[PDB]
Amino acid sequence: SNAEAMAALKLVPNNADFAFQFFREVTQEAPNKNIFYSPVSISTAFAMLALGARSATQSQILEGLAFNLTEIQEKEIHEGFHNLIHMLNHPEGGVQLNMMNAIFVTAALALLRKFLDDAKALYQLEAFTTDFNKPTEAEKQINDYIERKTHGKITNLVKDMDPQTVMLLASFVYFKGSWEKPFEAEHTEEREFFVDAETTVKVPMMYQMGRFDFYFDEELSCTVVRLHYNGSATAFLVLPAKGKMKQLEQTLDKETIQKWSDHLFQRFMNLYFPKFSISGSYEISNTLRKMGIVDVFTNQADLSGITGSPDLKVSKVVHKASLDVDEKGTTAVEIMPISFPPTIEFSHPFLMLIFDRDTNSTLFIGKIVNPTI
Ligand SMILES: C[C@]12CCC(=O)C=C1CC[C@@H]1[C@@H]2[C@@H](O)C[C@@]2(C)[C@H]1CC[C@]2(O)C(=O)CO
Ligand SMILES: NC[C@H]1O[C@H](O)[C@H](N)[C@@H](O)[C@@H]1O
């Protein structure tokens, strides 16, 4: 839904499929914890490796990313992702996501100019020769890099790095949206959030009254509220009924998303939503292995497009996503609402799904069980 987004849009179902398989996988390996990551950022970091991959290494990357090579060209995927990053990262554009990919490669290996140029042009890759036999100084320099790159918002990407690391793939992304409809800060008050409930925490609960996109599904036992950001990003806030999270996790896919957005309608309501911040920080190898991306991690990797020899493999891929949510920030037609409008209060665990409306991509997937962690 942006026309400049032509190449990016060809990617829309494949990226959404990947986004939600990844989600299904990760909620299994960690069933009662905060989950927070950037699908678009993971998809983008891996497609970028595909630039340098050959044969079955390459085919597994692209397929595990949910592309079917018999129906889409490799040219189009890279064109797609270049168009996507360009739109998400562009200053004049609707998101300013500032999502970043970096590789840290052992000084003991060669790099091809062809890979460095292709990956810079397409994917804005920064690549660093790294002496992993100085773990202390490697760690400190990598974390300083993430810190400086994120204007302070993300620090401590890596800790205790194997001195035999061949290549670290880093993707990281910080976001704070500006709300199309701001919450009034005078009315934020600490209220109770029900984690367990053997557990209960106090959270600053924001408040706003007004017309918001809303939908209830009975099938899933979920209240859906959708809030726009200024620009083109939008947030779906999904409140499952007590006892219905496991079920929502196991079903959630892009068809569920399309159902929701097809059926949202503006409803006047009292909205209570926590002011909070969340990080997710993962080494994502297993998850991707389980999704069928195998050889890239093993000695059977063909990354010869990177080094010019079949000597490279991905030792470690760290993904860190970070988000702040608060009240901020910035007429002639106003509804005459019913006497006792509904109240929706996100005060028990919920999903937060952040998308771009210009490229129809999933920017963030959050499962918030405890907004004070
Ligand atoms: C699932 C969906 C439609 C089917 C598909 O294969 C890919 C997606 C993922 C992104 C979704 C999209 C549509 O639903 C419209 C959405 C929600 C979009 C993100 C932003 C969006 O354009 C809107 O929020 C407009 O309401
Ligand atoms: N198949 C074409 C596509 O993939 C290659 O690996 C090239 N290096 C890149 O520039 C191009 O867009």
Q: CB of 72 closer than 6 A to ligand 2?
A: no
Q: How far is CA 284 from CA 25, 112, 232, 250, 319, in A?
A: 11, 26, 29, 19, 7
Report whether residue 11 contacts ligand 1, using a CB cutoff of 6 Å: no
Q: Is the bond leading into 329 cis (omega within 30 degrees of zero)?
A: yes
The verdict on the CB of residue 178 being under 6 Å from ligand 1 is: no
**Residue nearest ligand 1's atom 23 by CA:** 357
Report residue 259 as tokens. Answer: 């159902």
- The ligand 2 atom at the shortest distance from the C-alpha of residue 305 is 6
Q: d(Cα 42, Cα 318) in Å, to the nearest integer? A: 10
CATH of domain 8-179+275-338: 3.30.497.10
With beta carbons less than 8 A apart as the criterion, state whether 162 and 339 touch. no
- CA 52 to ligand 2 center in whole angstroms: 9
Looking from the CA of 178 toward its CB, the CA atoms found within 13 Å total 8
SS3 annotation, the chain: CCCCCHHHHCCHHHHHHHHHHHHHHHHHHCCCCCEEECHHHHHHHHHHHHHHCCHHHHHHHHHHCCCCCCCCCHHHHHHHHHHHHHHHHCCCCCCCCCCEEEEEEECCCCCCHHHHHHHHHHHCCEEEEECCCCHHHHHHHHHHHHHHHCCCCCCCCCCCCCCCCCEEEEEEEEEECCECCCCCHHHCEEEEEECCCCCEEEEEEEEEEEEEEEEEECCCCEEEEEEEECCCEEEEEEEECCCCHHHHHHHCCHHHHHHHHHHCEEEEEEEEEECEEEEEEEECHHHHHHCCCCHHHCCCCCCHHHHCCCCCCCCEEEEEEEEEECCCCCCCCCCCCCCCCCEEECCCCEEEEEEECCCCEEEEEEEECCCCC
Contacts of 231 (CB under 8 A, 6+ apart): 93, 94, 95, 96, 177, 178
C-alpha 317 – ligand 1 centre gap (Å)? 28
Q: Where are the domains of the chain?
A: 8-179+275-338, 180-274
Experimental technique: X-ray
> In the numeric block, which tokens belong to residue 37?
């990551």
Ligand 1 site, residue 99, Cβ cutoff 6 A: no
As a whole number of angstroms, the distance between CA 238 and CA 168 comes to 34
Distance CA 244, CA 248 (A): 6
CA 330 to chain centre: 25
217: Cβ below 6 Å to ligand 2?
no
Query: Closest Cα partner for 109 from 308, 333, 370, 351?
Result: 308
Contact 98, 91 (CB under 8 A): no
Q: Which two tokens stand for residue 322?
A: 């970070």
Given a contact cutoff of 8 angstroms between Cβ atoms, the answer to whether 104 and 149 are in contact is no
Task: Extract the tokens encoding 308.
Answer: 């010019």
Question: Which atom of ligand 2 is the closest one to the Cα of 79?
Answer: 12
Which value in Å is the resolution of this experimental model?
2.4
Determine contact, residues 141/118, Cβ cutoff 8 Å.
no
Q: Which ligand is nearest to the CA of 58?
A: 2
Whole-number Å distance, alpha carbon 351 to ligand 1 midpoint, is 16
How many Å apart are CA 177 and CA 213, to the nearest integer?
Answer: 18
Does the C-beta of 159 come closer than 6 Å to ligand 2?
Answer: no
Which residue's alpha carbon is at the smallest distance from atom 5 of ligand 2?
51
Closest listed ligand to the CA of 227: 1
| Domains 8-179+275-338 and 180-274 belong to one CATH topology | no
Ligand nearest to the CA of 17: 1
Domain 180-274, CATH: 2.30.39.10
The pair of structure tokens assigned to 186 is: 């005078």
**Paired tokens of 17:** 């499929």
How buried is 221 (Cβ within 10 angstroms: 0-12 exposed, 13-18 middle, 19+ buried)?
middle
- Structural contact between residues 174 and 98, judged by C-beta atoms closer than 8 angstroms: yes
Alpha carbon distance 39, 3 (integer Å): 22
